[PDB]
């Protein structure tokens, strides 16, 4: 019958597709480009891959920061592009499930809702918390999700299907900061990567060669003592460069934010702190269900390291289990695809009729 759409609007990458598919059809940068100078390249705006590719003649804007929309005109351009160009749908024909960051401001949830109904004329819509979707994708109703993407890392305790907002914490460090840090430490070796194409190289080095050391001190010592940890990387121009301790120093910043001159506790402590903000009677179930999600959780070794660090923080009789699904870059989107497909979800959406009667604030009563 009616085909729902699922859009996960990330700060760095939008993931969009059709409910019931196992993966998003479209994954593209959350970027809007406009003519840089007000004097071809000639359209009013570009979005996604095309905007990034035409950056030489466009000024680029990233309307989502820490998962929160900061520019609604640009966000509307991204959604229009998503519907008409990426998914090739008429949005007036489809219920739309959208995702939101933990603790998304009230006014923002209302604005999302107003735009869908008034700008796009969606027949129905729903807004889900990203972390809760990841937990569902892992087949659980209780656990703590550590969601680390582009600008922010959140720890979100969830009990019997619902986030505990009083216990949600955040570390203001995620993948873009790790890319920037890799850029900085690679300069110590004499490699300067400063342009956009060069930053993309650095991102690829982070994604392909970095890993989380189980014992950082010991890994540094191994790296200082021999070339065993070194790896070669070929640049697009053909030059071959060598990378050593930068491989594990880069994601170490997740556990030691002082590496970036931050006073904040590392992700392991943030996770522990969130657990300790929860009712003592549910903490066992949180430690036993720590679910990693998001692109910045994709480092090899991260689950082993989280296990070690949380084990050190928790009582020795507490069972720690870190769940790190291979599909975790997409687990939010996948949780959305499942939710939107359920026979029960037709009963859950906000309908156009409901919006017409109640206005945007209906979102606080239907989606929580």
């Amino acid at each position: 019958d009616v085909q729902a759409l699922v859009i996960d609007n990330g700060s760095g990458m939008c993931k969009a597709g059709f409910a019931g598919d196992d993966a998003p059809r479209a994954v593209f940068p959350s970027i809007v480009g406009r003519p840089r100078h007000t004097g071809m390249g000639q359209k009013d705006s570009y979005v996604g891959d095309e905007a990034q590719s035409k950056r030489g003649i466009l000024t680029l804007k990233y309307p989502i920061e820490h998962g929160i929309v900061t520019n609604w005109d640009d966000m509307e351009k991204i959604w229009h592009h998503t519907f008409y160009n990426e998914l090739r749908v008429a949005p007036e024909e489809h219920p739309v499930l959208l995702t939101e960051a933990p603790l998304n401001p009230k006014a923002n949830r209302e604005k999302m809702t107003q735009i869908m109904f008034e700008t796009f004329n969606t027949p129905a819509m729903y807004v889900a918390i990203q972390a809760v979707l990841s937990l569902y994708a892992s087949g659980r109703t209780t656990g703590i999700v550590m969601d680390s993407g582009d600008g922010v890392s959140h720890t979100v305790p969830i009990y019997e299907g619902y986030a505990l907002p009083h216990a949600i914490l955040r570390l203001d460090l995620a993948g873009r900061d790790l890319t920037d840090y890799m850029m900085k430490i690679l300069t110590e070796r004499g490699y300067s990567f400063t342009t956009t194409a060069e930053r993309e190289i650095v991102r690829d080095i982070k994604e392909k060669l970095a890993y989380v050391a189980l014992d950082f001190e010991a890994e540094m010592q191994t790296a200082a003592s021999s070339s065993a940890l070194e790896k070669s990387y070929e640049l697009p121009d053909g030059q071959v460069i060598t990378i050593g301790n930068e491989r594990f120093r880069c994601p170490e910043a997740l556990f030691q934010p002082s590496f970036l001159g931050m006073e904040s506790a590392g992700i392991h402590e943030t996770t522990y702190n969130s657990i300790m903000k929860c009712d003592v009677d549910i903490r066992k179930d949180l430690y036993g269900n720590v679910v990693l999600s998001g692109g910045t959780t994709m480092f090899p070794g991260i689950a082993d390291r989280m296990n070690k660090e949380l084990t050190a923080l928790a009582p020795s009789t507490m069972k720690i289990k870190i769940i790190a699904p291979p599909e975790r870059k997409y687990s939010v989107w996948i949780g959305g695809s499942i939710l939107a497909s359920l026979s029960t979800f037709q009963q859950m959406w906000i309908s156009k009729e409901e919006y017409d009667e109640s206005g945007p604030s209906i979102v606080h009563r239907k989606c929580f």
Binding site: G20, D22, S138, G139, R140, T141, G161, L342, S343
Partner: protein
């Protein structure tokens, strides 16, 4: 403008006893009563145990059982339907995740002769 209309929810937890549904392509489908306790390892199920309390109110334990080979749409749906059923039952149900081979004593105790596993199951909805 919307009320819970899913026919199986309307049947759930009306009287003391055991009720079992299987996830089949994003829907909750009742298991024939004579097949209770025989679980396909390729599938996910939702089990509601209803017990009568002394004031005549009903006690609910909701278990979602996950076969070793069930697909992500099935285990994900089982978890979500469990939350939805608990909400439908006014939050009165304790939720239990039951993994094949690691089920709680409580869950195993529902099946007088012992539960049984069998290979196979219904196709993924993905």
């Amino acid at each position: 403008h919307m009320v819970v209309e899913h026919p199986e929810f309307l049947k759930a937890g009306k009287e003391p006893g055991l009720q079992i549904w299987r996830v089949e392509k994003f829907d909750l489908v009742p298991v024939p009563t004579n097949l209770y306790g025989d679980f396909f390892t390729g599938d996910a199920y939702v089990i509601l145990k209803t017990v009568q309390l002394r004031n005549g109110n009903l006690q609910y334990d909701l278990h979602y059982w996950l076969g070793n080979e069930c697909s992500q749409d099935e285990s994900g749906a089982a978890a979500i339907f469990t939350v939805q059923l608990d909400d439908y039952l006014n939050g009165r149900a304790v939720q239990h995740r039951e993994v094949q081979g690691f089920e709680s004593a409580t869950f195993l105790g529902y099946f007088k002769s012992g539960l049984k596993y069998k290979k196979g199951g219904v196709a993924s909805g993905f």
